[PDB]
Design a protein around this ligand. Structure first.
Ligand SMILES: *[C@@H]1O[C@H](CO)[C@@H](O)[C@H](O)[C@H]1NC(C)=O
Ligand SMILES: *[C@@H]1O[C@H](CO)[C@@H](O)[C@H](O)[C@H]1NC(C)=O
Ligand SMILES: [Cu+2]
Ligand SMILES: [Cu+2]
Ligand SMILES: [Cu+2]
Ligand SMILES: [Cu+2]
Ligand SMILES: [Cu+2]
Ligand SMILES: [Cu+2]
Ligand SMILES: [Cu+2]
Ligand SMILES: [Cu+2]
Ligand SMILES: [O]
Ligand SMILES: [O]
Length: 1017
């Protein structure tokens, strides 16, 4: 078929509403709405002028078609089954130039509707920028290459948006859904067997970016005269946390019937504070491929879910990111009312208060140093005195008891010793009923909210609307018996593991209860997978890990805690930056700096890890199990990623004896103490070894100190701006007064020919694209790689790598001038998992100082392949190099700064002047070397690392990619965070120079982009 759509871009006023009335008890935490929606002297209220796509009937952009109420300000839903020829007739009826760039479909440079130095000429640039009054019809092709994966649903979710300056064009309001179905999935422009199809975009629509900021200030502020746009609160007062554009329970239209087959197309959109956690309170929207309960979304994350509306009632959709939840990102939706499970599991739990100590040994187990040594990582969090609480905090948490007689606890075995602060594991099987007899015992009402089980409205553990103890409100001394059900439609899918890591927390006020201590593990399993004791049947060890930043400043018991441990409360300024840092407890299961115990097992044991987390947008973790590799959802990986409310079930079979680290790779977190140890003991006696390593490879690598330049040519930057017509100044690149430019000394891994290390291997063409990265080491499964590593720098470094097996756990640092040998064995578990592609990459890095060594430059890819036009390989490392952590910072200042004496290393402006947001070490088109031909088979090895900020949604303009074993899944955006190493298959089809970039606002403007060339066959 060949669809035609008429899209006009009009200017208009949008009201984030307030439905000027109530019946809306959003009351998860909520009331300071009047910042966001308050009109006034400075503030603008809930009315902003914003351009937006509308659908017209004819080429006469006069007669409009009306888009669903629930769609909010998004553009009209554009659909197309594979093989279609969609033509989009755009007419810019607005005050400035806009375009229409689509995400998941094929077109030529004359139809990209995106502007950048792509060496194209006039006929191909008509699309790339539509002026007011001009009309342009975009021709798109639903190719089989962009077709939803062999294992994707029938219709995936894609997006279209303007692209002169996308962040701004999108903040301005120009963005809509593009749903792509496979061959004849659709029927009457709706999926063949669905009842309701919805589109939801989570986003902190930041009005400070919209082109109409001025027009909005000058209009609504009563005193436009005196508003500081550069004012933190003014800015915050323009950030509209909202789902479909609507901000405080305002989303209308969401309505289905019970037994309704709903399909939801989600997608985030935003800057780096856009760490979302979509959650549909009422049911089991659990059909991604497996059963999912909460859906994480980031800038341009394209996601599709399938639900079967059940459990009739007025439910709620929210974003479990705490900060977003209290900034009002909720939206009612409802399933109108248009057998059970007899095995009763009975638990008795009391919430009790205690004085939790985050680190008992009072020492950093990792370094055997005193946890309060003057000026150290730990110091800040544990220093105790006048205005610093210190190490232990009167917390409040769940503990199990023997019976309604809340008299005697249950003895916690060495088995559950690791549990730390977490509550008592609640568990059950598919087809059961749970009855937790909660008994509050603290100075505040609380309750227990369970993620993952089926519960009626009488058992809802929170209260949203539109002295007895209620499920939602169990007062300080009352008690209540929640009843939950674990019916089929809420427990593990066929493709799911035997047990799903789950959780439960106090939901009287999530944004505060959890941080105080009310969070506990839960485990829902396939029917008959557990023994009487609650342990899986052929599993040796079951562990539960909860890494988070226990925000003590948000504890219900904060005041008391100030009163108890400070040597001067009255004097405690509760809002000092430094005060709140000292109480941001970066910890795992309650412990810090190595102090967590109980993670011991036998080599050969079948271990099963249950990970989960909660918290705000700073909860972007990369849990790294050093020394071993697990098996998640058919994929071999050794670093799990967790965000607000994420839950995972890892399966591991440790294979090397020793004491290894379970740590959170993401910098802040690691420095702040988010690292633990787990021990593998030898529990058998096994073999004599001259029987297996069919291959041997040896590489000679060295670490050199080079002068690196993040942007050696500034042309592409320059050209990109003039096209956009921007008056912008580059903070990171412009030497300015005393700033250090774009060049900084760094230490990097360069390959050599032999043990003499006097002749380096010349980087050929197919490897110019590696930039700062070390060489692409290759190893097949069954190898015994040997790295002869020589340190030519001026301070101890070493080389180690994820996924690889080693003899011991310790890693000897190579001293300068010294040359050592490291040996990595590449057994089966270091290679492709069952559903993995044949080659998978692992980052090799330096261990002397996990952090400073990295930012200093030391990083590279190890590709480990499985089996025995051309085939290409590219390695991309998206990382915001924090040049402030370089071991070489002092030299750079003296070497590069025009006036070193005038530099203050603490000056916020300076700090930022060093945050090089780059790809493989270079920003703004400066990443040369990515060239293929039409027809080639390309393998992109993407890997991210770094701090909390490192959310990187990689987008390739004009081409999509496939990704699991056999390219079973399709998409054009890939989510990447610290510790993510992924391999994407792609077949270039349309020739031309295309833009490759991170889709998150700060990152784009910062330079995280370059271009890849597809040459004509
Ligand atoms: C575009 O034009 C010139 C020469 O072709 C130069 O800027 C560069 O080589 C070209 N850029 C790209 C991305 O091909
Ligand atoms: C561009 O930057 C200059 C300073 O370099 C500034 O004075 C001016 O307002 C900006 N915009 C235009 C159109 O000149
Ligand atoms: Cu985009
Ligand atoms: Cu959110
Ligand atoms: Cu972390
Ligand atoms: Cu932090
Ligand atoms: Cu990014
Ligand atoms: Cu795009
Ligand atoms: Cu783009
Ligand atoms: Cu930044
Ligand atoms: O795209
Ligand atoms: O994009």
């Amino acid at each position: 078929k060949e669809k035609h759509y008429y899209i006009g871009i009009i200017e208009t006023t949008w009201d984030y509403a307030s439905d000027h009335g109530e019946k809306k008890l959003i009351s998860v935490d909520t009331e300071h709405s009047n910042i966001y929606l308050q009109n006034g002297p400075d503030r603008i209220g809930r009315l902003y002028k914003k351009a937006l796509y509308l659908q017209y009937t004819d080429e006469t952009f006069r007669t409009t078609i009306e888009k669903p109420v629930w769609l909010g300000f998004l553009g009209p839903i554009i659909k197309a089954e594979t093989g279609d020829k969609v033509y989009v007739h755009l007419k810019n009826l607005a005050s400035r130039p806009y375009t229409f760039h689509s995400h998941g479909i094929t077109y030529y440079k004359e139809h990209e509707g995106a502007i950048y130095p792509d060496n194209t000429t006039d006929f191909q640039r008509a699309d790339d920028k539509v002026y007011p009054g001009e009309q342009y019809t975009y021709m798109l092709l639903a190719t089989e290459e962009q077709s939803p994966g062999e294992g994707d649903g029938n219709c995936v979710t894609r997006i279209y948006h303007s692209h002169i300056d996308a962040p701004k064009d999108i903040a301005s309001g120009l963005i809509g859904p593009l749903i792509i179905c496979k061959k004849d999935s659709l029927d009457k422009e709706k999926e063949k067997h669905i009842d309701r199809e919805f589109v939801v975009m989570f986003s902190v629509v930041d009005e400070n970016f919209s082109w109409y900021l001025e027009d909005n200030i000058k209009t609504y502020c009563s005193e436009p005269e005196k508003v500081d746009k550069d004012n933190e609160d003014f800015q915050e007062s323009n950030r509209m946390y909202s789902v479909n554009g609507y901000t405080f329970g305002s989303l209308p239209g969401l309505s289905m019937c019970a037994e309704d087959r709903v399909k939801w197309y989600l997608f985030g959109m935003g800057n780096e504070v856009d760490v979302h956690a979509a959650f549909f309170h009422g049911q089991a929207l659990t059909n991604k491929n497996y059963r999912i309960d909460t859906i994480n979304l980031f800038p341009a994350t394209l996601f599709d879910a399938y639900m079967v509306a059940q459990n009739p009632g007025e439910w709620m959709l929210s974003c479990q990111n705490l900060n977003h939840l209290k900034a009002g990102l909720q939206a009612f939706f409802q399933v109108q009312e248009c057998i059970r499970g007899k095995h009763v599991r009975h638990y008795y739990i009391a919430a009790e208060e205690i004085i939790w100590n985050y680190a008992p040994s009072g020492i950093d187990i990792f370094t055997k140093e005193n946890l309060t040594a003057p000026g150290s990582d730990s110091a800040v969090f544990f220093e105790q005195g006048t205005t610093r609480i210190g190490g232990s905090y009167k917390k409040l948490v769940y503990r199990e008891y023997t019976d309604a007689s809340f008299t005697n606890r249950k003895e916690r075995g060495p088995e559950e010793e690791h549990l730390g602060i977490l509550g008592p594991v609640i568990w059950a099987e598919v087809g059961d009923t749970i009855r937790v007899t909660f008994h509050n015992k603290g100075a505040y009402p609380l309750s227990i909210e369970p993620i993952g089980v089926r519960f009626n409205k009488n058992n809802e553990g929170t209260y949203y609307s539109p002295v007895p103890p209620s499920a939602s409100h169990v007062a300080p001394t009352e008690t209540f018996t929640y009843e939950w059900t674990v019916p089929k439609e809420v427990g593990p899918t066929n493709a799911d593991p035997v047990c799903l890591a789950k959780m439960y927390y106090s939901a009287v006020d999530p944004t505060k209860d959890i941080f105080t201590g009310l969070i506990g593990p839960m485990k829902i399993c396939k029917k008959g997978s557990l023994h009487a004791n609650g342990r899986q049947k052929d599993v040796d060890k079951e562990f539960y890990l909860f890494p988070t930043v226990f925000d003590e400043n948000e504890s219900l018991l904060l005041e008391d805690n100030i009163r108890m441990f400070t040597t001067a409360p009255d004097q405690v300024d509760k809002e000092d930056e430094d005060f709140q840092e000292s109480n941001k407890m970066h910890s795992m299961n309650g412990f810090m700096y190595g102090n967590q115990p109980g993670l011991t097992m036998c080599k050969g044991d079948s271990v099963v890890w249950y990970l989960f987390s909660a918290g705000n947008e700073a909860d972007v973790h990369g849990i790294y199990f050093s020394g071993n590799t697990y098996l998640w959802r058919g994929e071999r990986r050794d670093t799990a990623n967790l965000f607000p409310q994420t839950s995972l079930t890892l399966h591991m079979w440790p294979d090397t004896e020793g004491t290894f680290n379970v740590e959170c790779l993401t910098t802040d977190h690691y420095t702040g103490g988010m690292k633990q140890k787990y021990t593998v003991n030898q529990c058998r006696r096994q073999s004599e070894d001259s029987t297996f390593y069919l291959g041997e490879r040896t590489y000679y690598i060295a670490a050199v100190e080079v002068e690196w330049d993040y942007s050696p040519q500034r042309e592409w930057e320059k050209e990109l701006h003039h096209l956009q017509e921007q008056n912008v100044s580059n903070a990171f690149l412009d030497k300015g007064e005393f700033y250090i430019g774009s060049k900084y000394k760094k230490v990097v891994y360069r390959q050599y020919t032999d043990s003499t290390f006097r002749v380096p291997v010349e980087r050929k063409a197919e490897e110019e694209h590696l930039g700062i990265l070390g060489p692409q080491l290759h190893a097949d499964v069954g190898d015994k790689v040997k790295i002869i590593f020589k340190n030519m720098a001026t301070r101890p470094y070493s080389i180690h790598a994820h996924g690889v097996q080693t003899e011991s756990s310790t890693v000897t640092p190579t001293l300068p001038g010294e040359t050592l040998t490291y040996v990595w064995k590449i057994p089966e578990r270091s290679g492709a998992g069952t559903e993995d592609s044949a080659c998978i990459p692992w980052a090799y890095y330096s261990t002397v100082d996990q952090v400073k060594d990295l930012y200093s430059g030391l990083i590279g890819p190890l590709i480990v392949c499985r089996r025995p036009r051309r085939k290409l390989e590219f390695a991309l490392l998206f990382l915001v190099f924090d040049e402030n952590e370089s071991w070489y910072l002092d030299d750079n200042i003296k070497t590069y700064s025009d006036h070193p004496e005038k530099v203050n290393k603490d000056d916020e402006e300076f700090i930022e002047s060093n945050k090089m947001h780059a790809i493989n070490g270079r920003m703004f088109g400066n990443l040369q070397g990515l060239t293929m031909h039409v027809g080639d088979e390309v393998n992109w090895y993407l890997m991210g690392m770094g701090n909390e900020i490192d959310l990187h949604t990689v987008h390739f303009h004009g081409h999509s990619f496939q990704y699991k074993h056999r390219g079973v899944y399709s998409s054009d955006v890939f989510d990447i965070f610290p510790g993510t190493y992924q391999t994407l298959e792609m077949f270039p089809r349309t020739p031309g120079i295309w833009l490759l970039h991170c889709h998150v606002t700060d990152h784009i403007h910062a330079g995280m982009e370059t271009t890849y060339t597809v040459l004509q066959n």
